[PDB]
Symmetry: C2
Subunit: 66 residues, 2 copies
Amino acid sequence: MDNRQFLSLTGVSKVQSFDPKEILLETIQGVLSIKGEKLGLKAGQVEVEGLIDALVYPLEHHHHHH
Amino acid sequence: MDNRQFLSLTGVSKVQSFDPKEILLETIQGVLSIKGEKLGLKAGQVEVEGLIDALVYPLEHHHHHH
């Protein structure tokens, strides 16, 4: 079926990197990493077109008991 | 600037849990979890506004351990 999706975000703190195979943008204070394939201004907003095959974001906050 | 940001996503298979302090949307690959505060329609699209302080997504797919 259609697994393609669009992801948009703004208020980015800085552009750590921008690649069609991986995009890294730091927002607020954490860093968001986008992984997928075929990831190809105004309002100061940015949009992205491609299928997300994975997402990784450090959750520096989890401690858990065991 | 600021910490508030706009985030929208489409092509979601089904909503698992929609809460203002937590959102779990079952989309391609698996389920995307979003954590923060104040995280909250035609076209079948979903829009969420708020400060994202943490993001957790399962990057399994293939085995990778050391």
